[model samples]
Target: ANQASVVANQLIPINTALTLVMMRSEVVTPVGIPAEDIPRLVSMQVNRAVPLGTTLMPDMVIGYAA
Candidate 1:
């Protein structure tokens, strides 16, 4: 889960997508919380889903920025 969290976090450029970045996945699931409580937990945070499609720009450079 640690590695998955790292990969998920790094998959986007935070500088360009601050809100989108927060919408990724929660780092911590609330302690003792049940699955049914997930929606409430998510509601407490800024959650949204952004689909990343292929970039068609011919001059676009593909790279990961930290």
Candidate 2:
């Protein structure tokens, strides 16, 4: 098996609300952002624009609520 990844990036919009639905992948993983399957991922707001089909990284999200 490849490892975990975003099965849906409809959640990964730029500077907006995100909810991660992580899944297994082939091209990447074993894995990228070495965190567990988290309820923590519900806490996501994109800092910079990343495209769909790209994996989520801890460095990519930031605190955005004001």
TM-scores of all predicted structures: 0.20, 0.54
Highest TM-score: give the candidate number: 2
Candidate 2 residue-wise lDDT, 1-66, digit = tens: 545643334445666666545322334653444335335556566687666566666666685221
Model 1 shows how many backbone clashes? Answer: 0
lDDT of 1 by residue, 1-66 (tens): 321121123333322433333233333422122223323332132123322421111122123211
| Candidate 2 lDDT score at position 15 | 67
Q: Which 10-residue window of candidate 2 scores lowest in summed lDDT?
A: 22-31
Global lDDT of each model? Answer: 0.26, 0.52
Which stretch of 10 consecutive residues in model 1 shows the poorest summed lDDT?
A: 53-62
Candidate 2 regions off by >4 Å?
20-30, 63-66
TM-score of 2: 0.54
